[PDB]
């Protein structure tokens, strides 16, 4: 069996949806067109329901037929473990219902892995489709018992060391361990019968469900990390014209989770929402190209579309498909085929992509999400007083930097390497990360002391990991920030922070923060209040502005001032060595990468007008390698059309 | 035959030749005085109303010892008889005071026995009054909240499932849904109403049996009218402006009432029908879309129903309830027990009937030959696919009824009659469908059996117009668009894609720079036998298939819903007229062009043709009437309408009846 | 000391005590509180922070706070707050079980026996914020109490005439249940302490007044309190009318108190981060506005929640008057100016009596209960929703506030109907949809004896059993000299245009038409009878059955309601009471007396400087208090946006 690595040739692929009633002729037509569309890979849901017989034996014939037709057309298979479940369950169950159900799953894995491991075109086991859910089954006996046991094996006090009341987030910490346990158990079950094939899983809805996911632990039992990134389910925090930024952030979040493992996008939107989806669309040909290039530029080893062909009955019947109802290519399959073709014509370049890290990392943590859920009591009013502000704030910084043509990491705090000796020219952004503990504050102190730049806005560090506010009891970040909060005062959803000397008018959301400096240099507003500071801490710097300016940019639909302020704070080396825009461009993105020593840039225009983007930083002259609407450059000034995707190769 | 007439006895038996009546609920509860009740019947008689409806509350007849005391209702029946008023009597067993509408099914076997006792006592006693006109078996059968929680319903559903044999796969092997709940609910309504009819018939074989289905644009998926015909003498209805017409603005409650009348008329088949429950007065705290009907609306509603073959209009209510829910609400009389402008208006229509008995007793709607068809299964599949979302678009509950109602409105604004029928109420057995038209607008579920009926209809000369997602699914929510399109033969074409767009977009045709409003989804197709119609992007968006002697126009984008969303039915009117057989436009009075917020429907009585015209626009309108034969004589006009040679000048809110000389 | 109507008013604040705090921090709070001219604190006596593993009471945490209070001469309102979940911000409202009741008995014995011995204890707060919108009918203690209550009451399903009725068993039980538990808490305290004032803070009064029988509570309290939070309780108003909200809230509690002194136990002292329904941080200007409104309405105190903040989870670092460095915010600086004014003006400030115009706006429990039945709990913000029966009288209250006229805001049973003469008195019944025969006889007596009755909206449409006498035989026909004909629903906002006086009154939702017998009819420009004036003995009735107070609310314009109401007031009210020469949008005035001297409070909530011409009563304006340099010329006051002014009337 071929094993995926960081040097593998990336593929374009699609789900092949197999259910009873389909003909041999139909299935062959799908694999034939898939191969002709420069796709090398499919994913097949190994439905337990469609292998169980009246007598209780396993009949594999429906899936044998599909695997053999895949093999005939040289198509490799991602096989999803999908035990018997109700027909109406579109995504699959996330945990066993009962001990008896766990034994049924054991039997399912034994039978399916023992049989299908023998196909030479099997590429990977997907341990479970879309682990995690917003509706965790605390009602069910299996989960209820595991939670009770977990609480008894943990030793939590109702008071902290100083004597203050605390919350312990038992449910949230259990759910992390429970996901770790079930996925590790699935991996162990597969490994009883198959030690040869890659193990894979697709975390999903990552801007909501990241607080369920411990990716560093998952690395210990996976060969590759996957993902679902659907425009109609996962990108609700963005308008459609910023699905570029959404896909880039989603790719960066999975890339960070993968660490040293290769990653790929297991499940992308291939087609139309009729009745399905939260934010329904039919992707354009232009969007298909945008999403494949964004993922490959972010080190993806594959993009698999849900779905090649459609389900026929009830939920999503005739929805999501890349082929039309005559089983011929839509403009989406034609577009995807151009990217498969580009890969086959550019194998060495496309097999060795490394993202060009600017040195900017936007960090989120589980605990800011968990504390926010407790403090907002689950309200969904779309503001800072609602679920989602702790992810929308860092995503807004991410957007501002994308609109400056700067790459940024999007990482859980535990995925950041705090162990190095030197952080000169590195930048951490902590945007409205409302919960930080003493351990992470020491890591941030070390980072800044060793030359790091820390940017913090909104309610970053207002609470610890027990929802205890050190702002009230004795501020844990006083040392690092060289300053102390004074007040928060609630204002309107959108207000202006007007700096002394007109240096900036920053859009701000909901709360105005005021501070008192000791060691830091104060920054005053036109009302004579202290609204920000710069602290020199060892060899590094802190910029702290306790009003939500990233959320202010989001609310005002204008990232230009956040871009300008952030650029002014970046170490010179980042702007000298990284291709970026000469200024902020609304609804344009760029991210750069390297392959075998050569530098490349990806540029996408999501504005309504032709844009001329002046690219500066790094070295070399633009050669346009890919441009789907005949972009042209004059010196390093790129003229790019609405919805166009461009790859520049930088020569000498 | 002559055995039915010996059974009939002294009691009136309603027929398609009965003189229509205007009537009102007489609300009887304890605490009212003899003098008050007499005042109501006296004013009802003086208002040219011949008929009342009375709720025979079990609660107000049950005594401490469990005997029935009939005194309260005897008093009312005797005062009705004194003023020559006939009574529709509603069976309404003991129930909580707070239950405004009544329970829809028994709670338990024990409760069923209490209902049996109630029917025995009440029917045995009140059947003896010579002024009893009908038994209403149950008030407003059906509900949006069916009691699956209660033991009687839970057990009936379990038994039903055991007596049906469903597979999880179809003949070709594909997964299926069987809609067990929905099919049970049809059979459950059939069972309980048939049981109530059988219970009444134990004690009274003389009097008409009646029932009032309600909220028909939402609850039609509960109702099997063809089966109900087997135990009713007349079909009724509730059609309340404040409860049932939420899919329409108030200025189109004309169209809402016309469609509601057409839906019940279709359900009635060979039975006579009447409107059992119309809104007679004001909403204070009650209703979803609260109003107080204008005098003009009362006249509009009575004429629309009569023009659609109604044998009566009964207003809820003559007098008001006094305590809690609807206290001092809904009444046609004011708090001094005198006439509101609504009762004065209703009285003019009672007077017209007495002065025009032979005309008004023999109304037959002039069928254009256009039938707008809905089916239970499109509603059931929509409820499964939208997961019950209430966002008011194609991705929500209601689109499968709003789409056909939009075609209905376009035709109303062209002055053309159209039937509104459940697919099983359409007669597919004829040899010739020349000059007949079926509109299937976003009827998302069609099975092989109905497709064969449609093939036969078109082959034999029928015109079929299909828009939106018509035929996307079968009756098991299986999409033949995915597995092998069941309408390919009839349509001479095959779907290619749907692509979701905004709530309102334009279909921009290749030719004439022609534009159609469309809702939510753009459909593209590939033609084999059909003639393709292309858009400016070079995609095929519609086709005409010539199939035997008939034709099919198929446009798989929702253009009826596009007209609804744009609040403009003018293009849908023009397109539909262009597809009609010439004989329909030659033989039927209609407007020379589309008129926004005007309606006309035509009818015949004893060989003479008539037209009803209502102006709901803000301005005086001059409507040029063409088609059929004759010269306009204005027989009814409440605001001094005048005509010059078939051009009618009609005022805002005016109702006009033209007699064609 | 024992509170009385002659006590010197205080400014005070919650001192929030929880484990983890240092001696040094707590001392810093009491020191700054004393330096801020505050004499009083309130402390939540958390059972959770006194219970030991063995079940003994350890009082240490609260001893430390009481001793530091005493050192700085700060008196303590001590809230009885038995052991409860850390997540319970407000406290439980009733015992969960008989066993829980015994735990509460033990808690009261221990806490009252111990803390009664501190010389700086001022009052026991029997329970924090009695009442809740979500009553625990599910729990055994309440389930049993409701069963017993129903067995001891005998309700019929029909009235005397034979009509069906509702009996509102749940609502009547809840009144008796609140009365019982608060009386029981008072009796428990009195087992161990007969020396200290008993106090309680009813809250969210524009929603929860239907839970509260203040006349009964007087029998076991020494003072009535209140919570009046801008972020929880004033949702029926925009922020610019929180002046009117606070004035009405003060008037409602003042009416409930009767002969007892009252004070505001719980005002908003600081910022909402994640908490509150209508979140804000009060301005310095709002702090001053709220203290003066309450004192002008006879309040003996204003206590802010909170001096210092909670540290963990719910409201962590929220609500506090001090900043995160434990120094004064502009809110504490503002409150300190009012504490200073009181110390410099003790005799004036100790003897405030509100100058009653003679106008009383009456609400009743039963209108709220019948509305909840008729609207089925709908929250659509119109007359067909929960709240219209309180928003209607509050709208009249606002119209009068914008005329500079004081008005009482009273439950109907708090009005004294026993007097011989009501000459120059006015009752306004605005959309009080339920009235019974007993209250109608009291209103007949009131009008006969010289009273003026103003009724709008659906006042008297129903009786106390939700039976409409409008349907069966109108109970108010005698008093009104007229009979309803119809209601017809219209749009959310329409205009009632009088034939004669060219009043054009905004009206909400329903148009009422009537027929006059003895009354003089008032016709509109459509030729319909929409109102009447009935002469009844020495008094008069103005009846307009369309909602004109709710019309003013919906149009955001109280000017026409002001003009119409002024035209109906007895001359003596306009001659003897300071008021505005005309309607002023977003300005309020209320007047008071102390030791024979008359004063006026004026607040400008408009965006612009206003010049208000004050007329009525006697004397020349002297500005005694002004936070933005107001000036007067004769009796014409120039007042800045957000400014609070006290005029002393000299002659
Ligand atoms: O909703 C479309 C897709 C997506 O959710 C993924 C996976 O869950 C697949 O089963 C669904 O059909
Ligand atoms: O809501 C008004 C009417 C209507 O529902 C019909 C019937 O149910 C009657 O009982 C109601 O009073
Ligand atoms: O929410 C703010 C306040 C207020 O409700 C009062 C009291 O209940 C206190 O406990 C709260 O902290
Ligand atoms: Cl799968
Ligand atoms: Cl009835
Ligand atoms: Cl407290």
Numbering used by the authors:
A (entry chain DDD): 31 to 682
B (entry chain AAA): 21 to 681
C (entry chain CCC): 32 to 682
Paper text:
Exo-β-mannosidases, hydrolysing non-reducing terminal β-d-mannopyranosidic linkages, are widely distributed carbohydrate-degrading enzymes. We show that these probes covalently label exo-β-mannosidases from GH families 2, 5, and 164.
Soaking BsGH164 crystals with 1 or 2 (1 mM, 3 days, RT, pH 6.5) resulted in the formation of clear covalent adducts. In fact, an ethylene glycol monomer is observed bound where the linker could reasonably be accommodated. Our structural work shows that the epoxide and aziridine inhibitors bind BsGH164 in the same conformation found as 2FMan and that the N-alkyl aziridine binds to CmMan5A in the expected OS2-like conformation of the GH5 exo-β-mannosidase GEI.
